[PDB]
Amino acid sequence: EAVDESNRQQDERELDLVRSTIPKLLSRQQFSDAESLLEYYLDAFPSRAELYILAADLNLEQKKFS
Amino acid sequence: RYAYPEGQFSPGYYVKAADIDEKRQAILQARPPRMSVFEFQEKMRQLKLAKAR
Amino acid sequence: RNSFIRSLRSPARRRYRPEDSFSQTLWCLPDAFFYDTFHTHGRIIQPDALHDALLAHHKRRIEAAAMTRR
Known about the structure:
3 chains, B: mainly alpha, 0% strand, Histone lysine methyltransferase, SET, putative (chain A)
């Protein structure tokens, strides 16, 4: 069982840090670093809804509405 | 948007670039490097300390 | 209600030996040797017989929990 709680624990350590950093660098320019950070986790965890929401907010403030 | 488009038209001849094998590498090709939070912040810390000093 | 009032009583004062022809013939045995036959039957059938599920916490805590991976 020990691999399960270890893999689960490292999920919210990374993802709560993503939910903390992504609104931060999105406010003060840094659009290139933000889409570089989101593109790894959008493919590594390719079913989580909140990563696609923050990706949508990034491309909305880039005025790439499509 | 209303301006003259560049090559997007039928130029007489037909021509293709479909080429499924090298089209795989032809679409990688634009994606930025994939930073991994700790990797992003060690990049930021190393640049903001060494270049500042 | 009454099963809860039963648990108000002393734990030393809660003993049941089932009446059964094995209990009468084998007069001397520990009481735990006949507990299996039909009342752990009841403790298994009672939560499983009704079995609703299929709301959220079953379409959400099974679907979304198994959906997130690495």
